[PDB]
Nucleic acid binder design. Structure first.
Length: 49
RNA sequence: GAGACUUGGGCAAUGUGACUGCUGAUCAGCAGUCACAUUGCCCAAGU
RNA sequence: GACUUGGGCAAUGUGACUGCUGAUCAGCAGUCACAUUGCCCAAGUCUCUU
């Protein structure tokens, strides 16, 4: 923090390896194991015309 | 994306300008302290 | 009666040393303002983009 020249290029955007949440990790089903099926309910709200 | 324009947060310096504060030495005046010199007086002794 | 030594009381001075005031001069420091041209970010308006 005492240095000054370190901020001459402060626009240096940081790059990261993205990752998935816990439920998304290793969720690919295999043969012979019980998995979960999540139905997607939806509700159209626009006027019926 | 290319850009122009403005306020910002600043980073820099090239100037330049003025402000403020302090130390030290010297001189003068005054006050006071150390020693020293001169003219006396008197005393203490010894021979 | 000379000779010697020492001390004390005086006055008349001198040599300096500090203390205070004022003045003079040299010597340092902390700033501040501000024109000039530069650099990196933040948010804005517009051409274009669309």
């Amino acid at each position: 923090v005492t240095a000054t020249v370190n901020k001459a290029d402060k626009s240096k955007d940081r790059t990261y390896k993205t990752e998935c949440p816990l439920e998304f990790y290793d969720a690919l089903p295999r043969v012979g194991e019980i998995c979960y099926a999540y139905e997607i309910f939806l509700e159209p709200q626009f006027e019926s015309c």
